[PDB]
Amino acid sequence: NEPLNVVSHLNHDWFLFGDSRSDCNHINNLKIKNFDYLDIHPSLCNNGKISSSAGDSIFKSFHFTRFYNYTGEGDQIIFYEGVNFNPYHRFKCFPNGSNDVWLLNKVRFYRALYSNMAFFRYLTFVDIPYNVSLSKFNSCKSDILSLNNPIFINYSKEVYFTLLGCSLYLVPLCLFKSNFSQYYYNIDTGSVYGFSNVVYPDLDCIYISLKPGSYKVSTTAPFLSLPTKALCFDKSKQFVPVQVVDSRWNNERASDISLSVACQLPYCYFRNSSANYVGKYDINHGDSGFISILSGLLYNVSCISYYGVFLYDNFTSIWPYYSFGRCPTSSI
Amino acid sequence: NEPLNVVSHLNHDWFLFGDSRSDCNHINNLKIKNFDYLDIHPSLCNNGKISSSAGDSIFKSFHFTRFYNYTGEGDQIIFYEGVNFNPYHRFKCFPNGSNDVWLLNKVRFYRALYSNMAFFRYLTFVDIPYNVSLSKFNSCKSDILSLNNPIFINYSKEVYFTLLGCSLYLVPLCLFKSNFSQYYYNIDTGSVYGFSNVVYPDLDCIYISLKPGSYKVSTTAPFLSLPTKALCFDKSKQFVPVQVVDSRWNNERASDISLSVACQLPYCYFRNSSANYVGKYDINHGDSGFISILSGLLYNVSCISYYGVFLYDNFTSIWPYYSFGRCPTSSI
Ligand SMILES: *[C@@H]1O[C@H](CO)[C@@H](O[C@@H]2O[C@H](CO)[C@@H](O[C@@H]3O[C@H](CO[C@H]4O[C@H](CO)[C@@H](O)[C@H](O)[C@@H]4O)[C@@H](O)[C@H](O[C@H]4O[C@H](CO)[C@@H](O)[C@H](O)[C@@H]4O)[C@@H]3O)[C@H](O)[C@H]2NC(C)=O)[C@H](O)[C@H]1NC(C)=O
Ligand SMILES: *[C@@H]1O[C@H](CO)[C@@H](O[C@@H]2O[C@H](CO)[C@@H](O[C@@H]3O[C@H](CO[C@H]4O[C@H](CO)[C@@H](O)[C@H](O)[C@@H]4O)[C@@H](O)[C@H](O[C@H]4O[C@H](CO)[C@@H](O)[C@H](O)[C@@H]4O)[C@@H]3O)[C@H](O)[C@H]2NC(C)=O)[C@H](O)[C@H]1NC(C)=O
Ligand SMILES: *[C@@H]1O[C@H](CO)[C@@H](O[C@@H]2O[C@H](CO)[C@@H](O[C@@H]3O[C@H](CO)[C@@H](O)[C@H](O[C@H]4O[C@H](CO)[C@@H](O)[C@H](O)[C@@H]4O)[C@@H]3O)[C@H](O)[C@H]2NC(C)=O)[C@H](O)[C@H]1NC(C)=O
Ligand SMILES: *[C@@H]1O[C@H](CO)[C@@H](O[C@@H]2O[C@H](CO)[C@@H](O[C@@H]3O[C@H](CO)[C@@H](O)[C@H](O[C@H]4O[C@H](CO)[C@@H](O)[C@H](O)[C@@H]4O)[C@@H]3O)[C@H](O)[C@H]2NC(C)=O)[C@H](O)[C@H]1NC(C)=O
Ligand SMILES: *[C@@H]1O[C@H](CO)[C@@H](O[C@@H]2O[C@H](CO)[C@@H](O[C@@H]3O[C@H](CO)[C@@H](O)[C@H](O)[C@@H]3O)[C@H](O)[C@H]2NC(C)=O)[C@H](O)[C@H]1NC(C)=O
Ligand SMILES: *[C@@H]1O[C@H](CO)[C@@H](O[C@@H]2O[C@H](CO)[C@@H](O[C@@H]3O[C@H](CO)[C@@H](O)[C@H](O)[C@@H]3O)[C@H](O)[C@H]2NC(C)=O)[C@H](O)[C@H]1NC(C)=O
Numbered sequence: 001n002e003p004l005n006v007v008s009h010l011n012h013d014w015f016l017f018g019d020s021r022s023d024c025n026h027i028n029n030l031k032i033k034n035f036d037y038l039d040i041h042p043s044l045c046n047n048g049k050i051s052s053s054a055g056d057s058i059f060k061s062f063h064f065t066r067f068y069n070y071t072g073e074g075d076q077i078i079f080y081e082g083v084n085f086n087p088y089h090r091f092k093c094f095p096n097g098s099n100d101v102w103l104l105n106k107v108r109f110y111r112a113l114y115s116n117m118a119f120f121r122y123l124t125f126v127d128i129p130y131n132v133s134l135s136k137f138n139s140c141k142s143d144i145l146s147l148n149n150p151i152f153i154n155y156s157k158e159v160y161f162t163l164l165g166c167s168l169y170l171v172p173l174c175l176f177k178s179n180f181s182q183y184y185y186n187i188d189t190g191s192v193y194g195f196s197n198v199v200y201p202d203l204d205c206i207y208i209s210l211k212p213g214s215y216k217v218s219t220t221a222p223f224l225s226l227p228t229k230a231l232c233f234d235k236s237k238q239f240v241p242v243q244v245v246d247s248r249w250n251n252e253r254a255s256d257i258s259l260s261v262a263c264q265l266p267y268c269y270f271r272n273s274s275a276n277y278v279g280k281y282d283i284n285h286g287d288s289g290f291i292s293i294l295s296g297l298l299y300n301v302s303c304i305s306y307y308g309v310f311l312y313d314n315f316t317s318i319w320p321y322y323s324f325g326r327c328p329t330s331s332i
Numbered sequence: 333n334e335p336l337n338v339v340s341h342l343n344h345d346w347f348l349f350g351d352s353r354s355d356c357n358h359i360n361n362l363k364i365k366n367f368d369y370l371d372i373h374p375s376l377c378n379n380g381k382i383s384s385s386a387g388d389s390i391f392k393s394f395h396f397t398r399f400y401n402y403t404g405e406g407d408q409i410i411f412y413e414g415v416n417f418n419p420y421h422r423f424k425c426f427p428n429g430s431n432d433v434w435l436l437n438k439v440r441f442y443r444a445l446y447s448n449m450a451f452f453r454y455l456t457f458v459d460i461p462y463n464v465s466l467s468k469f470n471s472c473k474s475d476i477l478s479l480n481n482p483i484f485i486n487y488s489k490e491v492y493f494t495l496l497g498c499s500l501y502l503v504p505l506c507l508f509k510s511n512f513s514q515y516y517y518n519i520d521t522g523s524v525y526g527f528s529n530v531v532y533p534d535l536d537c538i539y540i541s542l543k544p545g546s547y548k549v550s551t552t553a554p555f556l557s558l559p560t561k562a563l564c565f566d567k568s569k570q571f572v573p574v575q576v577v578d579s580r581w582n583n584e585r586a587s588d589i590s591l592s593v594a595c596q597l598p599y600c601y602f603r604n605s606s607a608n609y610v611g612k613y614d615i616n617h618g619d620s621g622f623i624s625i626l627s628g629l630l631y632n633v634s635c636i637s638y639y640g641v642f643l644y645d646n647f648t649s650i651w652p653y654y655s656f657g658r659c660p661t662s663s664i
């Protein structure tokens with residue numbers, strides 16, 4: 001037996017959050033209409049256990065108008081996304097700003113996402129309804145991405161928004177640069193969630209996990225910055241960690257380390273290719289090492305460890321540290 | 333092999349947070365000066381790996397003048413405390429109040445404590461220094477317990493307190509009944525921590541985990557409620573869960589379920605006696621089942637699971653679910 005650098009599952013209940021490298025609906029918008037762009041084995045399209053869009057991550061769909069309603073449910077959860085918001089995209093809001101605080105926003109968003117998806121099993125995006133108020137206010141623009149989450153409104157009063165139906169949410173709380181402090185005060189219970197931005201040049205965010213109540217917003221600022229899209233975590237289950245595959249570009253383009261900083265123990269197992277990224281369909285689709293990683297979905301396993309995935313459960317060479325499931329031993 | 337209902341350790345680096353049932357200095361204040369009151373095996377006094385006081389829990393030492401500076405360091409952490417703040421003590425602040433919100437405060441405190449001690453290894457109590465301001469204000473009293481954490485002061489301005497030296501703190505943020513909102517705004521970074529109390533009759537608390545910065549307090553209230561004691565978590569290590577033994581009274585006295593509600597997976601393993609509590613030294617010291625539980629400290633083991641502790645690592649009967657360490661298998 002040997003630990004394997006794959007992502008897998010223990011039973012028939014798993015789910016994958018994919019992208020254009022795992023999109024079975026991406027063939028309807030290509031020129032060469034084959035299956036040579038998928039990083040997964042192409043017999044996995046008929047499951048319904050894969051949510052994937054033509055060039056959408058969960059962060060990009062969460063903040064921006066380039067939207068795909070991800071929806072999934074499963075015990076073991078595997079992610080393959082994050083290639084659609086990188087230092088390659090150079091996203092800012094005003095030319096004196098920067099994108100490193102956007103990479104910190106990506107780290108905080110995926111940290112909150114793995115930390116909540118290790119405990120819940122259902123995931124979808126929900127909207128935040130309001131009245132017909134002052135609709136938007138264009139404070140950020142970059143000609144390649146335009147965000148709607150969060151809304152910017154001239155303050156003048158305390159707005160309200162309710163949350164029901166779900167079990168645990170994930171809204172943003174974003175500010176540019178101030179001495180002020182926006183709050184998401186709960187009317188029913190009384191729990192207060194706040195954030196300020198002192199020294200971060202561009203639009204800094206944190207990602208709180210709200211409960212299904214009714215919330216008001218108060219900031220004492222010229223612009224309250226209030227969300228319009230939020231996640232939805234349902235059907236709280238027993239603790240199952242969330243697996244990652246390192247979704248990055250080719251080395252001629254930019255990359256980051258955000259999916260490894262956000263993926264920490266015990267709630268998360270990070271799988272990375274050892275070699276570089278050499279595509280098959282084009283430069284940026286179909287690497288053989290990532291086919292070797294994603295090929296573990298095709299079969300049940302016994303154990304899931306921090307160092308690898310174990311197929312059989314008789315014995316093994318190295319000890320499974322931070323193991324999960326029916327796991328073999330290394331004693332003679 | 334068989335899973336055991338004990339608490340144990342994997343190497344020479346462990347620590348126990350005890351009480352008067354595990355206090356080797358409690359013999360200097362007794363009448364019958366023997367070792368028949370310890371729930372542990374009495375050859376463990378010379379380690380320095382046990383912190384324990386004559387009738388102090390960590391919650392009681394954290395809020396009240398009945399104080400013991402707990403100090404410990406270790407990889408595997410075992411608790412045996414919580415018998416010193418129960419529904420047997422009937423603690424309130426004003427006769428129209430209640431102690432069930434104090435049991436909710438105990439649940440939230442121990443949840444924050446296990447969640448942080450699963451990742452750090454050093455634990456001690458620190459003080460919060462101030463100027464010579466208005467010293468106290470007696471808002472709560474119960475003739476058996478008098479708390480100093482938090483201080484109550486007529487507001488009149490925004491106070492400041494700094495935190496340095498440590499790596500991660502744990503301060504309270506407590507209020508009685510208001511429509512107002514106290515905050516612990518960070519001057520340096522800008523992170524805001526707040527809480528309000530709408531419908532909870534007695535002094536409700538939440539326990540935030542501050543970073544070592546400099547914090548100001550603003551509430552817009554007649555009384556800001558500001559801490560004077562805080563925990564200190566140092567030397568961040570790799571994830572090791574924190575073990576609990578169910579520290580309760582005898583059944584003729586009151587009990588609770590707080591140490592089982594606060595101890596949830598994956599960060600915590602809860603060990604409980606199956607039978608009742610029949611003491612040996614008196615009614616409330618030295619049960620044979622808790623001697624059987626605490627006797628696992630005397631020897632190294634291989635695995636630590638949610639269902640039991642495994643000594644050898646050849647094979648076992650049932651599968652170790654949520655295991656930890658060098659763990660055996662159950663495949664034939
Ligand atoms: C998953 O695993 C892969 C490995 O397969 C990791 O890829 C490595 O990523 C790091 C950074 O992300 C790379 O380090 C950088 O190397 C540059 C030079 O690389 C040349 O040499 C290598 C062989 O050594 C060639 O393969 C490669 O094609 C290049 O020809 C340096 O110039 C970089 O330094 C610059 O950036 C840093 C960033 O902080 C600055 O501090 C420096 O001052 C400088 O400006 C950098 O050191 C590494 O080369 C990659 N390896 C390979 C084999 O490609 C992934 O990072 C990993 N995934 C995660 C999430 O960690
Ligand atoms: C660790 O494991 C021990 C078991 O060894 C648990 O102890 C049990 O604790 C629960 C509650 O904490 C007890 O349930 C209560 O039982 C009362 C009657 O008990 C009699 O009968 C048992 C045998 O069945 C005798 O052993 C016992 O001495 C008594 O003679 C009920 O009257 C209680 O109901 C009342 O309180 C509840 C509280 O919500 C109300 O809702 C009810 O309406 C009612 O007012 C209650 O059901 C149980 O008896 C204990 N077992 C034993 C063997 O003593 C520990 O709780 C566990 N530790 C943790 C943290 O869970
Ligand atoms: C992203 O996708 C998710 C899931 O795909 C989605 O959440 C779902 O939204 C739908 C509607 O958008 C919800 O469906 C409603 O559920 C309630 C409660 O069960 C029903 O009463 C509703 O029925 C009424 O409306 C029907 C027509 O829609 C009528 O036929 C009927 O007679 C009723 O009048 C309705 O079915 C659903 O509850 C949620 N949640 C789940 C878990 O499915 C989410 O809204 C999407 N978000 C975005 C931004 O696209
Ligand atoms: C609970 O207990 C903990 C640990 O027992 C305790 O934390 C420690 O407090 C002491 C002092 O109370 C700290 O010791 C100081 O550390 C600094 C930095 O190393 C030294 O520079 C200091 O030395 C000065 O003072 C000495 C006399 O105390 C002089 O001899 C010397 O020349 C210097 O002038 C001093 O040793 C210590 O750093 C902390 N932390 C740790 C990890 O030990 C905590 O204060 C206690 N809390 C309560 C409420 O009792
Ligand atoms: C991994 O383990 C799971 C364990 O559930 C396997 O799922 C189960 O696979 C068997 C294969 O024979 C399914 O039985 C078949 O069911 C269909 C109807 O669903 C029936 O028409 C067939 O004749 C056969 O009886 C079983 O239903 C299925 N369990 C489910 C879906 O809950 C899974 O196949 C294993 N392998 C992989 C690669 O996932
Ligand atoms: C559980 O495992 C740990 C693994 O570290 C054991 O600790 C080690 O025990 C040996 C026992 O021989 C110690 O060796 C002795 O060291 C002393 C000096 O410390 C020396 O005087 C003796 O002659 C002997 O060589 C070893 O130091 C110790 N490791 C430490 C302290 O880091 C432990 O004994 C095992 N058992 C239990 C019940 O904990």
Ligand SMILES: *[C@@H]1O[C@H](CO)[C@@H](O[C@@H]2O[C@H](CO)[C@@H](O)[C@H](O)[C@H]2NC(C)=O)[C@H](O)[C@H]1NC(C)=O
Pocket residue numbers: 312313314664
């Ligand atoms: C290890 O577990 C496998 C599970 O089937 C046992 O069966 C062996 O499986 C391998 C690969 O699937 C085959 O190459 C062997 O021929 C199988 N052996 C037999 C006897 O059928 C295997 O016996 C187990 N090894 C042990 C318990 O030592």
Ligand SMILES: *[C@@H]1O[C@H](CO)[C@@H](O[C@@H]2O[C@H](CO)[C@@H](O)[C@H](O)[C@H]2NC(C)=O)[C@H](O)[C@H]1NC(C)=O
Pocket residue numbers: 332644645646
């Ligand atoms: C299981 O592990 C033990 C670890 O020592 C092996 O040794 C046995 O230990 C038990 C209890 O300590 C003794 O009763 C046996 O006599 C020991 N056996 C031998 C051969 O010394 C034991 O061999 C292992 N069992 C396996 C691998 O099946």
Ligand SMILES: *[C@@H]1O[C@H](CO)[C@@H](O)[C@H](O)[C@H]1NC(C)=O
Pocket residue numbers: 095096
């Ligand atoms: C912002 O960018 C503009 C672009 O020319 C520059 O003139 C200006 O100095 C920068 N800084 C501020 C504070 O406006």
Ligand SMILES: *[C@@H]1O[C@H](CO)[C@@H](O)[C@H](O)[C@H]1NC(C)=O
Pocket residue numbers: 130131132160
């Ligand atoms: C705006 O929404 C609030 C939500 O509580 C509601 O009370 C109010 O009537 C709405 N106003 C309009 C004009 O729809």
Ligand SMILES: *[C@@H]1O[C@H](CO)[C@@H](O)[C@H](O)[C@H]1NC(C)=O
Pocket residue numbers: 178179
């Ligand atoms: C915010 O505070 C800083 C320092 O206190 C000050 O320099 C700056 O002018 C303030 N900005 C506003 C809009 O008050």
Ligand SMILES: *[C@@H]1O[C@H](CO)[C@@H](O)[C@H](O)[C@H]1NC(C)=O
Pocket residue numbers: 427428
């Ligand atoms: C509080 O307790 C006192 C004790 O007698 C009682 O008179 C009073 O009605 C109670 N309630 C309030 C709101 O003061």
Ligand SMILES: *[C@@H]1O[C@H](CO)[C@@H](O)[C@H](O)[C@H]1NC(C)=O
Pocket residue numbers: 462463464492
């Ligand atoms: C009170 O403490 C603050 C801390 O910043 C300090 O600035 C101030 O001088 C102190 N006042 C007195 C009277 O000690």
Ligand SMILES: *[C@@H]1O[C@H](CO)[C@@H](O)[C@H](O)[C@H]1NC(C)=O
Pocket residue numbers: 510511
């Ligand atoms: C707090 O709010 C409630 C309901 O809004 C009200 O009944 C109560 O009088 C308020 N208390 C104070 C001190 O304003």
